[PDB]
């Protein structure tokens, strides 16, 4: 079976929501912008980062979004972008789907109001990653992790290592003023298990770190930056332009944005990561400028 692909127009008129996007051809940045309509992206966590991420992808005209979150909108979330006070009490995925369909009815949505880490849900989650692509039965092009805990990150990690699914992970610090994105191509770059954070490594329940009546700080600025760089990386990856980052940090205090590349641990705790590394190493072993006006005789040494 085929999926139909509709025609995105270049026409520069007030009524064309894709006019300023299709202008990326004319400006020579992206030769085949309309290809965005052919991709499906799964987003786990539609909170601070994930909601803005979903909106940015919706506005770009992504073919399909799959949203996973089990939480509800609260007024305490109103310091972040996207959700509005009248949506308080709704499920994040239902609120998001409604707003996003209004924003761009060309985008397909599939949403799941559940916790991806539990026994009941995990297999459905993996089924949706594998079969929830633009054409049913094909995988999603990318998974984006916008969750706020290591257990959920490890779950996505396990799933993607098993499926050989490329994904990107985002995080924001508890003090609100730093964040990062990372690209995980299982076998090619470090998985989350290759270099676990202290708490995961020391087998400490992350729940034990949470004192009641205290929350993480968050800022709409940091969310916007992190979502922006995440989705920019997504566009660069899917539409093949610019340089894809394997890791990009953000330190708001001093405006430092480090790039890095994390390489797989050959003795990674996740056996599928190890297997993927094996497959990867096997597969590996197998102008002159014109000046229209130069009447003053300037010359380049």
């Amino acid at each position: 079976g085929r999926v139909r692909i509709e025609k995105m127009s270049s026409e520069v008129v007030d009524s064309n929501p894709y006019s300023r996007l299709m202008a990326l051809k004319r400006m020579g940045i992206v030769s085949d912008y309309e290809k965005i309509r052919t991709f499906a992206v799964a987003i786990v966590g539609v909170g601070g980062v994930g909601s803005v991420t979903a909106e940015m992808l919706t506005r770009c005209g992504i073919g399909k979004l799959l949203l996973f979150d089990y939480d509800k909108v609260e007024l305490a979330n109103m310091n972040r972008l996207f959700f509005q006070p009248h949506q308080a009490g709704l499920s994040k995925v239902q609120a998001a789907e409604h707003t996003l369909r209004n924003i761009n009815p060309d985008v397909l949505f599939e949403v799941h109001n559940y916790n991806i880490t539990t026994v009941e849900n995990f297999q459905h989650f993996m089924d949706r990653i594998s079969n929830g692509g633009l054409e049913e039965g094909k995988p999603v092009d990318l998974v984006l992790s916008c969750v706020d805990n290591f257990e959920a990150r490890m779950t996505i990690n396990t799933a993607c290592n098993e499926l050989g699914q490329t994904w990107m992970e985002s995080g924001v610090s508890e003090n609100a003023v730093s964040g990062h994105i990372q690209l995980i191509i299982p076998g090619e770059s470090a998985c989350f298990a290759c270099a676990p954070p202290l708490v995961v490594a020391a087998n400490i329940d992350e729940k034990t770190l949470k004192r009641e009546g205290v929350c993480a700080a968050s800022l709409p600025t940091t969310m916007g930056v992190v979502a922006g760089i995440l989705v920019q990386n997504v566009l660069k990856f899917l539409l093949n332009f610019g340089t894809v980052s394997f890791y990009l940090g953000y330190n708001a205090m001093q405006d430092f944005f480090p790039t890095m590349s994390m390489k797989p641990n050959p003795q990674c705790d996740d056996r599928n990561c190890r297997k993927q590394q094996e497959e990867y190493k096997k597969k590996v072993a197998a102008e002159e400028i014109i000046h229209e006006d130069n009447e003053w005789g300037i010359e380049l040494v």
Partner: protein, 78 residues
């Protein structure tokens, strides 16, 4: 008994500052990660560690084994 030394660089600071740590070889590397994080004033629990070349390290091993597999030059990812 025997000690190993690590030069740990903080990747999230533009100055890329480092700390050199002397560690009894039987110390679990998790305790080194913690010590380094505290030194750099970044949260221990959420910090990870990689080699200078960017290879992921699992810190649930002795300092000694980390040293043997990876050398002394490491980078903390807060």
């Amino acid at each position: 008994m025997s000690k190993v030394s690590f030069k740990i660089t903080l990747t999230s600071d533009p100055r890329l500052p480092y700390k050199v740590l002397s560690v009894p070889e039987s110390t679990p590397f998790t305790a080194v990660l913690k010590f380094a994080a505290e030194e750099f004033k970044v949260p221990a629990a959420t910090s990870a560690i990689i080699t200078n070349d960017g290879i992921g390290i699992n810190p649930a091993q002795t300092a000694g084994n980390v040293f043997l597999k990876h050398g002394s030059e490491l980078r903390i990812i807060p």
